[PDB]
Design a protein around this ligand. Sequence first.
Ligand SMILES: N[C@@H](Cc1ccccc1)C(=O)O
Length: 404
Amino acid sequence: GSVVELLGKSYPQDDHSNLTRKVLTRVGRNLHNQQHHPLWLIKERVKEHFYKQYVGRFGTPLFSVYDNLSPVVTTWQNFDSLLIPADHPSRKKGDNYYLNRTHMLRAHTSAHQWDLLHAGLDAFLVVGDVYRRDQIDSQHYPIFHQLEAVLLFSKHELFAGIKDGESLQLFEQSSRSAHKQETHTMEAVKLVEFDLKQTLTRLMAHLFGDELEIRWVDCYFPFTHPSFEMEINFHGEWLEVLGCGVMEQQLVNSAGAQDRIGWAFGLGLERLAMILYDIPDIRLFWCEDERFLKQFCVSNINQKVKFQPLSKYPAVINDISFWLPSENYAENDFYDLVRTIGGDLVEKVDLIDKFVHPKTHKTSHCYRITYRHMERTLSQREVRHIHQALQEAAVQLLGVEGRF
Ligand SMILES: N[C@@H](Cc1ccccc1)C(=O)O
């Protein structure tokens, strides 16, 4: 219709609006605040590291923790506050859940960094549900959870370890390099980067034990420089679990935190939980199967959980092919439709073939859908009927022409 009502507020619909009822109905579910949920367990262990295991020169900073911020944010909060350019590909309608042109469900917990800095906070964690439009497989879900951490330092704290530290400065006017921002001194950046990497290495040792294999990968974000991803070697592959870096000075200065340099990080809770607990499919976080959920009810949050694998059920594979409409088709629109109709019956969707017809000039797409339930065997009848409903919905709602 013309308006969406969410959390007591009204959003007029426009050309950017792309929310689905299934996604909207999970706003407020807050799995990260559900006692004994694995995502809540990871949040509680990370909070304990900051409460008891982080120490600086001036003692432990008191990190305040915000786990109940509304996910409805403006484009300015999600993008402009973090220096994301207007033409950046992360803003595309295909990849984000937009209530309208002005409001969206946050795609990251970094959407709250400016506001919390603007409130005068120098040490904080944000934990919350985040929303992205993407592909369907065992590692991707429309809703996932992140833990954000921000720590700011004055020159007095950063240089407290040396007698003439008061003569050193956070800022200078030089040039941006791979190692630093144009207005940062190398003296400050090396100390901030070291504290960021040391804190994260220690936290991973406090979540996983002492035999973990991690590596730092240099990368880019518009809101940090220098920036890194931490990867964990798991099942023979290097997997990214977080993004981090030295906060861009324009962001810190814009929020009113003058004379501070900071580090920031964003952890993917499902990515970490899937490695820490050997959870094979991200749909298990949303299931109500006691075989999965009972395993995370522990008396001490430091108990090493040894998750017991669930039985794996057979799959039913079906292909769906259709001619795309002349304009405006996006693969994410089809993936959203599969999530709406197929739901948690669908393990993955792969685009396996595309071609252009010589006479009509139309593009054909062929998608392979793997139906596999996490809790039971699927009947051939339920998959056949659901697959047919998906074909009808694609023609009616996406304007495709069936090749069926
Ligand atoms: N917001 C980034 C992670 C990040 C957070 C903080 C600093 C740098 C990177 C993401 O979602 O990938």
